[PDB]
Amino acid sequence: KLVKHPKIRDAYLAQQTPLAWQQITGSLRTGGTDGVQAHMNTFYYGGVKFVQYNGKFKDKRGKVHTLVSIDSVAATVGVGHAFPNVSMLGEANNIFEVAYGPCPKMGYANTLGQELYVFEYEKDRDEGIDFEAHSYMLPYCTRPQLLVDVRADAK
Amino acid sequence: ELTTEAVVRAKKLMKIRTKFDITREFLFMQALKGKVVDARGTLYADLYKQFD
Amino acid sequence: VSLLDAVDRDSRKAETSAPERVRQISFPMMYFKEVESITPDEIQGVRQPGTANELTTEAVVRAKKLMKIRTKFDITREFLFMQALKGKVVDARGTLYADLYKQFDVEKKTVYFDLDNPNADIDASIEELRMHMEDEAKTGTVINGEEIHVVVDRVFFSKLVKHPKIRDAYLAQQTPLAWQQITGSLRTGGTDGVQAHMNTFYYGGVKFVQYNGKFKDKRGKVHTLVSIDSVAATVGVGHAFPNVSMLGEANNIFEVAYGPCPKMGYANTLGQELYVFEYEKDRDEGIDFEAHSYMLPYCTRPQLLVDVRADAK
Amino acid sequence: MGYANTLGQELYVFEYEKDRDEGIDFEAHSYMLPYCTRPQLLVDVRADAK
Amino acid sequence: MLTNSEKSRFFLADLTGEVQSIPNTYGYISNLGLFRSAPITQTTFLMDLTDWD
Amino acid sequence: AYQGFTKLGNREPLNDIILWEQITPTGHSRKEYTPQASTEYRVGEVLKADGTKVQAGEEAQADSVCIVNFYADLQLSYHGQLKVVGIHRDAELKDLLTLEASVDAAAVKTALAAKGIDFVPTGL
Amino acid sequence: AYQGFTKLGNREPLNDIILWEQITPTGHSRKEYTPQASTEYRVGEVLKADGTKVQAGEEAQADSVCIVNFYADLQLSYHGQLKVVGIHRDAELKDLLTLEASVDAAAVKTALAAKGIDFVPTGL
């Protein structure tokens, strides 16, 4: 929807610069790698850079979770998120953090957490092997007012 | 040709690691969105209410 | 793989992943044969067409017949390769030998461009094609969907060129590429064997090539290489398949198999591309010829073959 | 476990302790089949005629 | 490699390798490296908020 | 092929659904059934007290979950044994049951749970 | 092996019954049939004009001798071919015919002899 808008189409068509030619008739796939795509769509306008992110995962009940979609908004309506760069506040004022907690096994109480524990045990009577994986974590933001949602909606 | 225990062990460990990486990515995205909720939809943190 | 679900620390509950799946398939092969012979009755008292007093010779007839046989085999091979690229393998008589989508139980995707609608968004369709080719690979490695071949029909090429969204976009640009594609000659491609150059068009990082190959059956019917099955000739059609560099050589997708000849001495020998045999007639009545072939081209990832249609429905 | 594809032995024996030092347990395993490749060379004999 | 035929135990046929498919795994944001690791010892943590006008 | 495609069949499910079992010198969670006439068995199916598969309207009679693949035409299991074996008490299994047409999974799960069989959620 | 034994079946007959046939560029003595929907074929069976096997009371309609093993379920021959083949003229064959129940061998042989097919005596 953003790219098709006449106020952008004509504005860049009338511009006789190398950037304008590429964005109107060339390929917009110039970004980095998302793990599936070699390059991902990128668009520059008004000093901002827009990136199209495709992300889906299957919940074991069956339904699909879309990373970028807003809650309770139909997929037919464009939606996006904006969050600050690391450099805006400076490395001295890091805003994002993750906390890792301990594991309930013996010998781990009151111990610094780790992102992943793996354990192995032998089944009784020499019948097989058993595995366990544990994790205890929470990501959070200290200045939530800097997170903004963009919608391609009228209201 | 016959399978062996080593191959099964390696495959299962790789599967577990992949699942955990996928979950971590999803949780990071949810946190960036503003609220932290698991795949089931349980609410664990609401930063907007927390910081008023 | 799926997403984990949070559990209570003191409850000590957990979830588990499901196992994998395995299955097997098989393929037959296609067999071809040819027959020819030479008789003295075709040499005696036969004037050479290009002269007034010269008689024909055995060597000329032999060379002509051999060239004809080889040309027939080459044409058949080209047709078979095109058919395999189209997703189904059938001889000129309509017999079905392989159904890739049935064996690999994967649905075929078609992309509509709606070139008859002035408001049609070509960019949306191109992005849809890229997303399909990239997401449906299922290879566990980075995929660059920009590298793909696009073979197009004359009607589809004309309709795409005529669209205002392309015409005005290229007119507004004061660049050498824009000048050449609007007022110059688009014939800058390689050689298809009948013409020096092939129509080529660039837009949005995709390259469109127009192909007009066609052949005829033993009973007069004309077969078109690019035409989609059961589509009207007035509707633009085309096919898109990945490049070699898209997946690399380690993951080659196109293969051709060759089997052995049913004659003595070839019980379990590796098949060759073509067999030729020569047998003189009894009582020096003449000479006989034979040509054999045994092949089947196939694709190991049919979901990567996509059709394209000018209309939208 | 540990014998998935190994060659079969004539007899296996195992020993295991009990839950909380209560005793000892034993197990014996065997897996075999005797067969004859030319059964027609086996003949029965009877003391009577009938 | 030779194996048994489709439906006969006394005939052979050729086995041409294998094909595998693997699910997709997006990782864009994790690679971005926004979040820092802050391991702790307990099951909860606290913070203080201050301001003036 | 004649129709253009040929399939040699998928691999049968193999015994990997047991996560926990009451390890005992003699099978405590396992019971043996005499196979029924011309009946195919596979891992994950639900059997009645007499070795017959549970059908619609009789979920209350579910007794055990089969864990051995049996071939009707050979009368021999895939390990060469002559009998069908199924878990009937004190075990934890993956949620990969096979049920007949129109059978209510919830009723079968409730009936089995009364015997101490617990099903663990399984990821996609 | 339950019930005492398990048999995996005998090897299918191999195409060796041919002793002489005038070889020509296009198989003068061989003819092709469209296989029936549910009929199995083996080497040495007598076929009618329409491809159906000769049965009792119609030996005079014998047409050719099958020389290809065909699998109905696969709908393919043992050489991966889509059609059946039979000998219908000018051939010498080993006396190894296979006939349905109550089919008179003498009548079939006499009918085939009219077409120029002869059978060589065969020992044990």
Side-chain angles (χ1 to χ4, degrees), chain A residues 6 11 18 20 26 38-39 46-47 73 78 104 115 133 144 152:
Chain A
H39 303 87
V73 183
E115 60 154 34

Side-chain angles (χ1 to χ4, degrees), chain C residues 34-38 40 42-48:
Chain C
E34 186 63 290
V35 180
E36 204 67 63
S37 71
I38 285 163
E42 330 191 35
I43 305 294
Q44 185 138 29
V46 179
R47 179 182 67 76
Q48 190 104 38

Side-chain angles (χ1 to χ4, degrees), chain G residues 44-53 55-56:
Chain G
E45 323 205 20
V46 188
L47 301 177
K48 295 204 276 304
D50 59 28
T52 65
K53 302 181 178 176
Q55 282 132 31

Side-chain angles (χ1 to χ4, degrees), chain C residues 1-10 12-38 40 42-116 118-134 136-157 159-233 235-281 283-306 308-312:
Chain C
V1 68
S2 188
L3 314 152
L4 296 180
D5 203 353
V7 296
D8 191 354
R9 184 166 175 266
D10 292 332
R12 301 190 174 188
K13 303 308 188 183
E15 63 185 342
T16 286
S17 56
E20 65 181 29
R21 291 193 297 274
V22 187
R23 70 186 179 287
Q24 205 163 79
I25 54 168
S26 176
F27 301 85
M29 301 219 278
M30 291 191 138
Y31 189 78
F32 302 101
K33 190 159 180 285
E34 186 63 290
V35 180
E36 204 67 63
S37 71
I38 285 163
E42 330 191 35
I43 305 294
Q44 185 138 29
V46 179
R47 179 182 67 76
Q48 190 104 38
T51 43
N53 277 32
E54 319 281 16
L55 310 174
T56 57
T57 69
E58 140 178 21
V60 178
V61 183
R62 190 204 193 86
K64 294 182 61 63
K65 292 183 165 182
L66 270 39
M67 153 206 64
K68 202 159 164 24
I69 291 159
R70 264 179 198 69
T71 304
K72 281 175 72 71
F73 270 90
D74 296 340
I75 284 166
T76 310
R77 292 172 92 274
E78 170 64 14
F79 178 80
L80 269 199
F81 282 8
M82 188 77 236
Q83 269 290 359
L85 283 173
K86 286 210 287 174
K88 296 222 303 193
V89 186
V90 312
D91 63 353
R93 181 177 65 83
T95 306
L96 178 54
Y97 281 77
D99 192 7
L100 298 166
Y101 296 110
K102 299 296 183 181
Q103 294 215 268
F104 293 92
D105 63 24
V106 66
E107 300 311 37
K108 190 178 194 186
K109 172 161 210 48
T110 75
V111 183
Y112 297 92
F113 279 63
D114 204 11
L115 297 172
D116 295 324
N119 313 284
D121 263 307
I122 292 156
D123 311 351
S125 51
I126 289 167
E127 191 60 21
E128 174 165 28
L129 176 57
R130 285 189 186 128
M131 275 162 195
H132 171 88
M133 221 77 89
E134 290 188 348
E136 310 289 32
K138 293 179 179 179
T139 175
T141 194
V142 179
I143 293 296
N144 181 24
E146 300 283 52
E147 307 177 37
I148 55 173
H149 280 291
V150 188
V151 177
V152 194
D153 187 50
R154 192 200 77 260
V155 184
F156 193 103
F157 197 84
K159 287 189 178 201
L160 182 68
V161 173
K162 286 193 324 188
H163 207 280
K165 290 195 176 177
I166 316 300
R167 189 83 170 188
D168 314 299
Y170 265 122
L171 281 164
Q173 290 179 26
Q174 303 290 4
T175 183
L177 171 61
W179 295 334
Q180 179 265 337
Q181 296 210 146
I182 299 290
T183 65
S185 185
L186 273 60
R187 289 181 163 275
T188 63
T191 295
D192 68 354
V194 159
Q195 63 192 314
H197 300 140
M198 312 192 68
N199 291 305
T200 310
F201 192 65
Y202 289 76
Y203 179 76
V206 179
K207 185 193 171 197
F208 300 84
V209 176
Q210 197 207 308
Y211 191 27
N212 303 338
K214 62 195 174 187
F215 300 113
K216 285 164 69 74
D217 304 353
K218 186 200 306 186
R219 56 202 167 286
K221 185 178 183 291
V222 176
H223 270 115
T224 305
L225 297 182
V226 189
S227 88
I228 293 168
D229 173 10
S230 204
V231 175
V235 177
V237 296
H239 308 286
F241 43 88
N243 268 284
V244 182
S245 39
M246 171 155 158
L247 293 163
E249 294 69 349
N251 320 336
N252 192 40
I253 294 298
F254 301 109
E255 312 276 40
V256 187
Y258 290 129
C261 173
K263 289 189 185 291
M264 191 85 228
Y266 307 95
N268 293 316
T269 62
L270 275 71
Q272 328 164 114
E273 186 167 336
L274 190 77
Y275 305 83
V276 184
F277 305 104
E278 187 107 354
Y279 305 121
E280 82 306 6
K281 284 190 168 75
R283 294 180 185 272
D284 67 29
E285 288 288 359
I287 291 187
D288 301 348
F289 304 87
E290 282 205 325
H292 300 232
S293 196
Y294 203 32
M295 72 207 253
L296 184 95
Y298 66 93
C299 175
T300 61
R301 290 193 191 275
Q303 74 276 16
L304 259 51
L305 314 169
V306 186
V308 163
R309 286 169 60 109
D311 61 354

